[PDB]
Structure 1
């Protein structure tokens, strides 16, 4: 499997900013056309995945209604970094966040999974 470093559980206070930090590592040098990164959210383990941010040539923020405008990219992918930031976290943000990285020429696709829990 691809070497992707994320916290399995991330506990954040309601109202604070939550950086979702993941590390992707693969040989070679990243290519802009070549490097693609996808982030998805799920309300629960079995719940449908909702893509909320992509990298395809550049960052594409899908502006999902469930996040308002609180999602930001927070990583320099050339550094193997693809972290995201969720500002002013709300209780409904609790759930599973998935990072998928496919990097040419690497055939393999990395996957990081973070369980975000919102304190009180």
Structure 2
């Protein structure tokens, strides 16, 4: 059973894909949460008759992102909190099948990442953004934006869209020639590298990382210091 660790605030995609040679529709998916067994459980989401229903304290953070016409009942849980630590069980039945697959996934939650990233002038840094996932190729779009304290508007640092022939755009303004993707988008990683950091690079970097139309958002405050 997969054991996934995430920091507080992160998203996690828990795969629930039924291995078949044929592309079958999903009839039923249930995702249930228990802290230990705990003697207690709660629904994250259920799906029947072509409708998903995120429930309870997961109602606004949870999404069936699997292709329900291709054997897939995978879940995206956003904004993970410490109370989300425990076991997620997927029960899934495909159209025209009687058998039910049951797949437990354990989620471990580490303390939230610091908001601030400290860098010295002239150094290189990474800004990391990725979704924790058992499944490849789920991220469809990554967009990095920048604002300083004095900006009237965000500017684009780097953008990648998997559903365009275009693919990858890099800044032609303040970050020109100093930014590139270090993440493998096919492995759900939108991380970038920023080279020869300047004082004027100080500010808020935002990553919007998409699984379909569903955005997960990450903020990094770049604090540029001396010596």
TM bracket (short chain): 0.7 to 0.9
Q: How many residues align?
A: 115
Residue 131 of structure 2 aligns to a residue whose secondary structure is: strand
Corresponding position of 1:38: 143
Higher alpha-carbon Rg: 2
Shift of 1:69: 1.2
Shift of 1:45: 8.0
CA deviation string 1:84-110 (max 9, x = no partner): 111000000000000001212xx4210
CA distance in 2, matches of 1:78, 1:56: 12
Which of the numbers 94, 117, 120 marks the counterpart of 2:223? Answer: 117
Gapped regions of structure 2 (runs ≥ 5): 1-60, 62-77, 81-111
- Runs of 4+ with deviation above 3 angstroms: 3-7, 25-29
CA distance in 1, matches of 2:150, 2:130: 22
- Residue 7 of structure 1 contacts residue 21 of structure 1 at CA under 8 Å; is this kept in 2? no
8 Å contact 1:3–1:24 — kept in the other structure? no
Aligned to 1:10: 117
- Aligned-pair Cα RMSD in Å: 2.5
Give how far 1:114 is off. Answer: 0.2
TM-score, normalisation: structure 2: 0.45
Q: Which residue of 2 aligns with 1:53?
A: 158
Paired residue secondary structure (1:110): strand
> What is the distance in 2 between the residues matched to 1:75 and 1:29?
13
Q: Higher relative contact order at CA 8 Å, sep ≥6: structure 1 or structure 2?
A: 1
Q: Normalised by the size of structure 1, how large is the TM-score?
A: 0.80
Stretch moving more, 42-51 or 72-81: 42-51
Q: Distance in 2 between matches of 1:99 and 1:43?
A: 15
Structure 1, unpaired ranges of 5+: none
Is 1:74 aligned to residue 182 of structure 2? yes
Please tell me whether the aligned partners of residues 208 and 218 of structure 2 are also in contact (alpha carbons under 8 angstroms).
yes
1:3·1:25 contact (CA, 8 Å) conserved in 2? no
Q: Distance in 1 between matches of 2:119 and 2:219?
A: 16
Provide closer, same or farther for how the CA distance between residues 45 and 114 of structure 1 changes in structure 2, counting only shifts above 3 A.
Answer: farther
